[PDB]
Amino acid sequence: QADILDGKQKRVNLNSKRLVNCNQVDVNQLVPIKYKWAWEHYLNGCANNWLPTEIPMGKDIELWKSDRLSEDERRVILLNLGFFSTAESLVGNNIVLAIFKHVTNPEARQYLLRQAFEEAVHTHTYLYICESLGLDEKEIFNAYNERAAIKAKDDFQMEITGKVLDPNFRTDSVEGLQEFVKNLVGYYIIMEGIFFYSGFVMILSFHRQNKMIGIGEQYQYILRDETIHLNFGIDLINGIKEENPEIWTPELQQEIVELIKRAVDLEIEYAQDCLPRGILGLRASMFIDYVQHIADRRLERIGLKPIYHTKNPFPWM
């Protein structure tokens, strides 16, 4: 029996929980869980646990060090490792430094903790690949400062991670919450839902042709994780919209479509930089259609109309 009788009044009421701005209820108590979709993403993520080094790199090392890969094939591998190597850190740091603080709900935060740790595992993966192949890790991890197409994507990303980090930033104003939703869109929809996809397609294409299968298998595990990251982000954005409808104005909607169009342009320039002529039957041309196609799929998931209407040239994805 409680020896602080008044404490019983602090048990959390399910119906008082909210995704953001919830400071009327004790955020430290997990129960009763309200957003079951967040708990499900958490359990699914936990079930997907994997260790990069359980994947053998022996055949990849032999192939990489032989004369059987073309310079154009090596280029695709190097450019994608360059971009992914720090993109994980950008995403992980954003979850922690920007999102977590403002998602005032314990079960959603449970998932964020799983998500951020999975970005650490992804980072470990690129380090393992670099050291396995004998690449200079310092050069690969610094790609986003040395390769214009990668830097452009990451500089674009900063244009949204910025604001939310200010010491005085708050989500308890319509404009503060809109700014927060733009950050969620920038990281979940754009970075994780678009910027990683040309790369997934290129790397998984090697795998399908039985080349660099160790890297291919690791990217398959990463893609499995990223699918959940994206689905969680979509549910979070949709949940915040539902609980704060005054936020989802024609103006915010248009700003979001604008950010997505800009990201599509940057992702196309990145796919062209990876494929100046083409390898494995892929041509940069195909990525214009593909990047525009997934952008339409992302738009629809957060209630916006598709704008490109292009067909998917990689249905196996």
Residues forming the active site? 128
Contacted by 38, from Fe ion, its own copies, none: CB < 5 to 8 Å by type: none
Identity of the residue, 119 or 273, whose beta carbon is nearer to Fe ion in the bound complex: 119
CB of 124 to its own copies, least distance (A): 8
Chain residues in the site for its own copies (CB under 8 A): 2-4, 7-8, 10-12, 26, 28-32, 42, 46, 49, 51, 85-86, 89-90, 92-93, 96-97, 100-101, 106, 109-110, 113-114, 116-117, 119-121, 123-124, 127, 137-139, 141-142, 145-148, 151, 167-168
CB of 34 to its own copies, least distance (A): 13
Provide, for the chain, the percentages of residues in helix, strand and coil under a 3-state DSSP scheme, each rounded to the nearest 5: 70, 0, 25
**CA nearest neighbour of 314 among 268, 282, 270, 274:** 282
Rg (CA), the chain: 21
Q: Which residues are annotated as a binding site for Fe cation?
A: 88, 119, 122, 192, 226, 229
Identity of the residue, 43 or 174, whose beta carbon is nearer to its own copies in the bound complex: 43
Q: Where are the alpha helices (DSSP H) in 103-212?
A: 106-133, 137-141, 143-146, 148-161, 174-184, 197-208
Identity of the residue, 106 or 298, whose beta carbon is nearer to its own copies in the bound complex: 106
Is residue 104 within 8 Å of 309, Cβ to Cβ? no
CB of 23 to its own copies, least distance (A): 13
What is the number of alpha carbons within 13 Å of residue 80 lying toward its C-beta?
Answer: 28
Identity of the residue, 33 or 280, whose beta carbon is nearer to its own copies in the bound complex: 33
Contacted by 241, from its own copies, Fe ion, none: CB < 5 to 8 Å by type: none
Contacted by 113, from Fe ion, its own copies, none: CB < 5 to 8 Å by type: its own copies
Is residue 286 within 8 Å of 197, Cβ to Cβ? no
278 DSSP 8-state letter: -
CB of 21 to its own copies, least distance (A): 16
Tell me the residue ranges of DSSP E strands in 150-271. none
Q: Which long-range contacts (CB under 8 A, 24 or more apart) does 170-173 make?
A: 171/20, 171/21, 171/102, 172/21
Contacted by 192, from Fe ion, its own copies, none: CB < 5 to 8 Å by type: Fe ion
CB of 141 to its own copies, least distance (A): 5
Structure tokens at 164: 């939310």
Q: Could you count the other beta carbons within 10 Å of the beta carbon of residue 206?
A: 22
Angstrom distances, CA of residue 176 to CA of 73, 97, 231, 280:
45, 16, 24, 46
Identity of the residue, 85 or 198, whose beta carbon is nearer to its own copies in the bound complex: 85
Contacted by 179, from its own copies, Fe ion, none: CB < 5 to 8 Å by type: none
**CA nearest neighbour of 98 among 169, 191, 197, 29:** 169
Identity of the residue, 150 or 213, whose beta carbon is nearer to its own copies in the bound complex: 150
Contacts of 42 (CB under 8 A, 6+ apart): 107, 110, 111, 114
Contacted by 229, from its own copies, Fe ion, none: CB < 5 to 8 Å by type: Fe ion
Q: Which residues are annotated as a binding site?
A: 88, 119, 122, 192, 226, 229
Structure tokens at 92: 């992980």
CB of 35 to its own copies, least distance (A): 15
Tell me the residue ranges of DSSP E strands in 12-145. none
